[PDB]
């Protein structure tokens with residue numbers, strides 16, 4: 023059986039098959055309907071940390087890759103006991119292909135063995151989405167596989183969508199007045215225009231996914247292939263990506279193809295570190311005891327009580343956050359409660375129009391209570407949400423005595439997990455490394471800003487003048 | 499006769515002898531009364547390098563290509579061979595030239611192939627730290643060299659103090675009450691403004707004590723009887739609408755002449771530009787002033803009166819601009835060549851060292867500025883500004899659109915164009931992208947760096963910055 027991991031960038035449960043208004047995702051909805059659709063799939067982090075984790079079946083904090091980005095060129099290697107997905111598939115006789123327009127691995131470590139056997143051939147900043155005519159199968163990775171090999175393939179296929187910059191879809195343009203907006207962003211034309219383009223970027227990648235499956239079926243390789251389709255983490259919106267709310271962690275996960283019964287919906291807890299062990303099992307390999315991920319499909323399935331996630335340094339922004347989630351409750355511990363949520367991060371300021379919208383509205387005291395939570399000068403050390411009653415996780419139960427028992431249960435589960443995994447995010451990075459990235463990113467802001475002809479100290483209201491023009495040029 | 503140029507940094511007419519309440523400047527007041535005090539001396543620019551390149555040569559910086567603060571530090575651009583430094587004239591006359599005072603900087607926007615000074619004590623960007631008033635300038639290597647190797651010759655000494663550049667320093671012998679300082683109308687009548695202002699005045703008192711110490715040293719050295727001293731600031735005070743700008747706050751400076759042959763109790767109300775100090779010094783020592791020199795001789799038998807003073811503002815650090823001013827005894831004309839740029843164009847120096855800039859950004863957002871204070875915060879500028887400094891000394895009522903002053907407006911506008919043609923104003927020629935992008939990055943870096951060092955976001959809101967500024971000021975002592 024061939025294996026495909028089709029990885030989408032920065033996307034929440036915003037497909038039409040997941041109940042999202044307005045967006046057209048016919049190809050992905052059809053794959054979901056023809057296989058198993060997972061409603062409770064969670065990444066283990068919300069930015070390199072998500073992909074270092076799911077390529078190894080280990081939380082990035084367990085292998086020292088918690089810091090986005092880190093260990094790029096300092097002689098830090100994967101510990102000998104930790105094998106990459108493709109080392110396992112190689113043993114089983116697979117040839118490993120790196121495909122898709124991206125061509126990146128985003129590991130927070132180096133390797134001494136190749137992650138893939140063939141690829142098309144640093145990925146920071148804003149992405150530009152190429153046209154939907156990309157013939158992925160006529161690129162060097164797939165060309166190499168067909169001409170030099172028998173053997174089955176394991177193929178990771180990375181799409182650039184739905185990363186910023188968002189791209190308009192004029193075949194089926196979206197009405198900003200009709201999209202569904204989480205309660206923690208302002209119901210404002212700036213928000214809805216940015217959000218319409220996010221969903222049009224999902225429509226764009228849906229077309230490309232349709233085009234890929236038409237290429238594969240004309241290859242004759244679909245009959246003996248299982249495809250995992252999943253986001254690496256939630257959508258590129260202000261309180262989603264980087265953070266440990268469901269907007270940042272919950273991702274689409276569809277399992278499709280060889281032997282997979284159709285029209286199934288799964289509501290069990292799945293963490294993205296579960297994809298490697300499940301792939302191993304599907305290919306008839308034993309999962310070594312060290313792997314933290316669970317097998318989630320088939321006779322060897324192993325159910326989860328909880329999923330876990332971390333937030334440590336992101337770009338220049340230093341933080342220390344951990345999450346624990348069962349089916350109902352989200353528990354979040356901020357280890358640095360004195361740091362604001364809105365701690366300076368060039369990426370967010372540079373690419374997110376809604377951040378300027380909310381700093382403008384916050385200064386005028388125009389935010390709702392839910393929207394202003396993110397703009398407090400400090401954080402409570404613990405957050406607890408009843409996601410059944412509060413899916414937008416805006417009502418923190420952690421000081422509510424009515425939930426203290428659940429609070430203590432998950433607090434203690436966090437400690438056990440950290441002890442059991444020897445959480446490396448609990449050790450400080452060196453000053454050298456922190457100051458390097460501070461210098462890397464604080465410069466990134468002032469220059470990309472000056473390039474836009476803007477002052478680094480630009481007021482939110484002036485930035486908003488620029489963003490309204492940015493969005494119009496985008497086409498919304 | 500010996501000549502001293504005693505140069506104070508960043509100071510307006512904020513001495514007690516000029517009428518400033520609360521500040522105590524007895525030493526500088528005594529010298530004023532014992533000499534000639536000038537009420538209408540103007541720098542040709544409002545930052546250090548362009549004002550100092552100007553007065554050390556007697557030429558407007560725009561006339562010699564030195565108009566961009568900072569420029570030409572290391573590019574093989576030298577002074578035109580026809581333009582001599584003050585010390586080249588002194589040397590011909592037989593002076594030895596000495597660079598004294600805690601500074602030890604020349605701040606030229608050009609390199610030289612001949613040393614500006616014969617002896618010195620041994621880049622002056624950022625914030626300064628004012629040393630204690632126990633400085634013994636004559637025990638430092640420039641004066642020690644002079645007396646050891648150059649006895650028999652008169653000296654020309656330029657004595658640069660660090661005051662009253664930021665960072666301001668408290669004076670605990672005579673601390674100033676912030677509720678009693680006089681604040682111009684274009685700054686908010688606020689506790690932040692007044693505390694920053696008291697510290698500024700207390701810095702004047704600190705350098706005043708140092709001037710009395712220098713003159714007590716000089717008297718003991720037995721050299722004062724054969725010396726003429728020019729005491730002048732290089733440009734006006736380090737406040738938001740003063741330094742860098744062509745209003746009277748950034749251009750008008752104390753000027754005192756004192757010493758041999760200078761009769762006391764004299765007050766002078768004639769227009770004087772700092773490019774006048776060189777030729778007047780040359781004439782005081784018996785040198786003819788070459789015809790090329792733009793400065794006027796303002797003292798003695800060869801006094802040549804001024805109809806106008808001029809001033810320029812081109813690039814200042816990273817902030818590109820192009821402004822010219824013309825002033826007679828009454829009217830100020832100012833032409834903004836880039837009227838689409840705001841006054842508050844980003845300048846890392848201002849945002850980093852000026853608490854009132856954050857104050858006013860916060861009050862502007864809340865619509866708390868008065869009309870006068872809010873003028874600086876417009877999104878663009880009128881191309882011409884005209885002020886009747888007799889009726890409007892704070893220069894806040896722009897008459898350029900008033901029909902009743904069109905005759906004056908066009909007179910001064912034509913005079914500017916005349917001057918630029920006459921002097922071949924080098925600031926009308928754009929700098930290369932390489933230069934502008936070197937400095938934009940040098941200073942854009944500085945800002946984020948110092949903010950992060952301070953523990954602040956480079957995007958910090960004005961109100962959050964005010965919390966920091968309140969602690970900064972308290973830690974300063976006010």
Ligand SMILES: OC[C@H]1O[C@@H](O)[C@H](O)[C@@H](O)[C@H]1O
Pocket residue numbers: 545546622623624625815847
């Ligand atoms: O950081 C650069 C700054 O350095 C100061 O010392 C100077 O007086 C300012 O005008 C500005 O150039």
Ligand SMILES: [Ca+2]
Pocket residue numbers: 031032069254255
């Ligand atoms: Ca991603």
Ligand SMILES: [Ca+2]
Pocket residue numbers: 507508545546732733
């Ligand atoms: Ca100065």
